[PDB]
C-alpha cells in the first residue's frame, strides 16, 4: 500500500519512489516517526519543512526541493511523509565509489564553489544549516552540489537563545565544544572539514568524545594565543592533506580558523583566488 | 543559556537587509483584517492576542515567537473558519508552532492546555493550521528588521543590546492592536525604533535625524514614517490586561 507512488529501503526513514502524478518521475519519501499524545508534531520537522518553503520562489540551485508533505492520520498515529526531488547520491558514497586517485581536483573547486554557494545564500535570508556533513550534501549527475536536511536551522535573531549541541562532534566547531556563542561560522567550519575529508577521502578531526575532538582540532590549527580565547591541552596543514594545492590550502585554513570572528565567511570565499580559475 | 551575538555575516551585511524587504513582498496584501469570518470580529482579535502576548511574556519566550505566532493565526484565519468558542484554541495552537520554531525551548501542549480543551484537540488543531497553510509557517516579522536597520543608520554597535531590548518590546505589544497588523513589517519596525529613540534618548541623536533616512532605507515617503511612529507609539499605549 503505497498512495500516489510506488515504494526495501534507501536509508524515520527514507525511500526511492516513482510519481504517478507526473510521467513516472523519481521522488525521495521521507517517513518520519510522531508518536502518540506527545508535543504534536515533531520540533525538527516544521524548522525543515519552513526553511525550504520559505525560500522556494527563489528557486536556488545548490538547495534540495522539497513538493509536499503527507500528514496522513481511531487506531494508527500520524504517518509524515515528505516528497523530495531524488538526488542519486550524497558526498560520503560518492567519495567511497569514486575510482582511484580519488576525485579529479577539478572537480573539488566546484563542487566546493557550489557549496559555499549555498551556504552564502542561506546566510544572506538569515537561516544557518548547523549540520553539514558529508551525509548532507548530495550530488546530482551532472556534478551538482544539493545541501540537504534543515531539521537543526533556523532564522537567527539578535540576543536569542541557542541549544549548547549542534552538527556532528566530528564537523563540530571549537565554538560549540567550548560552550559559547555560535552563529553561521559554524557552516563553514564544516566547510573547512568537508573540503578536507574531500581531498584526503577521510575526515580530518574524528574523535570519541567532545575534549577529545577539541584535543584533535587544536593539535593541527594549533594553540592561538589569548586574543583569540573567548591554561589546559601546529605542524602544516599539508601533513594531513597532501595533494592540496597552495592556493587551497589558504582558503583551507581560513575556514579553519579558530576564533569565529576572524573565520572566513562564505561571500568572500566565494571570491578568495582559489576559484579564480574556474570554468564559467 | 547561550544567547546570540553580533554576526557580521547576517546583520551588517547590506544585502540582508535587502532580501528582508524582497521576502516581505511574499506574505498577502490585507486589505481588510479577518474579513473572511462570519463570527469572530476584530475586537475579538485583540484580547486573544493579549492572551498571546502575555503567554509568551511570562514563560519568557524569544521576543520573536510573538510576531509570528500572530502572522500565524491571520494567514490561517484567512483559509479556515473560526467561531467565538473556538478562538482560544486557535491562537493556542498558534504559539504552539511559533514557539517550535523560534524559540530554544518550545511550548508544550501540557501547558497551554490546563493554561487555558483536551490534548488531542490542540494536536488536531496543530495538525489542521499545519496543512491550511501547507506548512509555509515562516514570515517576514517586523521583528527581523531591528538590527539591519539599526546597523543602515549606522547607530554604533555598543547600543544594539538596549536598543534592541526596548524596542522589541514595543513592538511586541503594538501588534495587539488591530491597524497594526495591515502595515508592513519593515514599516511597524521603523516605527518601533523611532519610537524607543525618543523616549529614553539616551546618548543616541534625536528621532527626527532617523526620519529622511528610514525614509531612503525602506523606500516610503517621509510622510508614511512619521504617521508608523505615531501608530506604533498609540497602539502601545492601548495594552490593557484589564481587557482579558
Ligand atoms: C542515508 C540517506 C537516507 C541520506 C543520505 O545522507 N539521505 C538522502 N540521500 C539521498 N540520496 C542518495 C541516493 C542514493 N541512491 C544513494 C545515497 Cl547514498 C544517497 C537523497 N536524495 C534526496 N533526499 C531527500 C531527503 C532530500 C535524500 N536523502
Redesign the pocket.
Known amino acids: 500500500a503505497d498512495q500516489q507512488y510506488e515504494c526495501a529501503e534507501?536509508?524515520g526513514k527514507?525511500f526511492?519512489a516513482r510519481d504517478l502524478k507526473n510521467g513516472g518521475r523519481f521522488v525521495?519519501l521521507?517517513r518520519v516517526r510522531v508518536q502518540t499524545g506527545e508535543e504534536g508534531m515533531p520540533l525538527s520537522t516544521i524548522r525543515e519543512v519552513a526553511v525550504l518553503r520559505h525560500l522556494e520562489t527563489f528557486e536556488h540551485p545548490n538547495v534540495?526541493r522539497l513538493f509536499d508533505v503527507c500528514t496522513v492520520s481511531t487506531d494508527r498515529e500520524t504517518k509524515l511523509t515528505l516528497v523530495?526531488?531524488?538526488?542519486?547520491?550524497?558526498l560520503?558514497?560518492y567519495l567511497d565509489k569514486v575510482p582511484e586517485p580519488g576525485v579529479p581536483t577539478e572537480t573539488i573547486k566546484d563542487m566546493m564553489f557550489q557549496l559555499l554557494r549555498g551556504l552564502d545564500f542561506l546566510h544572506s535570508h538569515r537561516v544557518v544549516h548547523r549540520d553539514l556533513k558529508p551525509?548532507?550534501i548530495?550530488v546530482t549527475s551532472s556534478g551538482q552540489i544539493k545541501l540537504?536536511?534543515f531539521g537543526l536551522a533556523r532564522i537567527y535573531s539578535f540576543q536569542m537563545a541557542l541549544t549548547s549541541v549542534v552538527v556532528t562532534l566530528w564537523y563540530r566547531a571549537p565554538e560549540v565544544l567550548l560552550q559559547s556563542s555560535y552563529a553561521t561560522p559554524v557552516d563553514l567550519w564544516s566547510v573547512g572539514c568537508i573540503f578536507a575529508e574531500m581531498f584526503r577521502r577521510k575526515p580530518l578531526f574524528r574523535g570519541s568524545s567532545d575534549v577529545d575532538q577539541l584535543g584533535k582540532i587544536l593539535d593541527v590549527i594549533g594553540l592561538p594565543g589569548e586574543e583569540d580565547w573567548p591554561q589546559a591541552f601546529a605542524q602544516p596543514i599539508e601533513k594531513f592533506v597532501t595533494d592540496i594545492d597552495e592556493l587551497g590550502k589558504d582558503l583551507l585554513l581560513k575556514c579553519l580558523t579558530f576564533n569565529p570572528a576572524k573565520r572566513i565567511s562564505a561571500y568572500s570565499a566565494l571570491s578568495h583566488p582559489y576559484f579564480q580559475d574556474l570554468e564559467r | 543559556l547561550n544567547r546570540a551575538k553580533i554576526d557580521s555575516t547576517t546583520m551588517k551585511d547590506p544585502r540582508v537587509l535587502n532580501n528582508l524587504k524582497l521576502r516581505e513582498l511574499l506574505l498577502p496584501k490585507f486589505t481588510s483584517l479577518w474579513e473572511i469570518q462570519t463570527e469572530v470580529t476584530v475586537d475579538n482579535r485583540t484580547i486573544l492576542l493579549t492572551w498571546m502576548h502575555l503567554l509568551c511574556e511570562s514563560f519568557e519566550l524569544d521576543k520573536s515567537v510573538f510576531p509570528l505566532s500572530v502572522s500565524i493565526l491571520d494567514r490561517y484565519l484567512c483559509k479556515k473558519q473560526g467561531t467565538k468558542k473556538t478562538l482560544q484554541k486557535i491562537g493556542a495552537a498558534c504559539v504552539l508552532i511559533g514557539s517550535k520554531i523560534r524559540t530554544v525551548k518550545p511550548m508544550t501542549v501540557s501547558k497551554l492546555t490546563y493554561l487555558s480543551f483536551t490534548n488531542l484537540e490542540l494536536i488536531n488543531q496543530e495538525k489542521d493550521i499545519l496543512e491550511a497553510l501547507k506548512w509555509d509557517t515562516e514570515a517576514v516579522l517586523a521583528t527581523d528588521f531591528l538590527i539591519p536597520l539599526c546597523n543602515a543608520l549606522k547607530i554604533p554597535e555598543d547600543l544594539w543590546p538596549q536598543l534592541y531590548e526596548a524596542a522589541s518590546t514595543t513592538i511586541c505589544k503594538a501588534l495587539i492592536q488591530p491597524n497594526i497588523a495591515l502595515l508592513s513589517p519593515g514599516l511597524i519596525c521603523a516605527g518601533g525604533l523611532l519610537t524607543t529613540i525618543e523616549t529614553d534618548n539616551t546618548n543616541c541623536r534625536p528621532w527626527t535625524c532617523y526620519l529622511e533616512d528610514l525614509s531612503s532605507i525602506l523606500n516610503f515617503s517621509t510622510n508614511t514614517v512619521r504617521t508608523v511612529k505615531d501608530q506604533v507609539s498609540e497602539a502601545f499605549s492601548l495594552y490593557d490586561l484589564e481587557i482579558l
Open positions: 534507501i536509508g527514507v526511492k525521495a521521507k534540495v523530495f526531488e531524488h538526488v542519486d547520491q550524497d560520503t558514497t551525509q548532507n548530495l540537504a536536511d
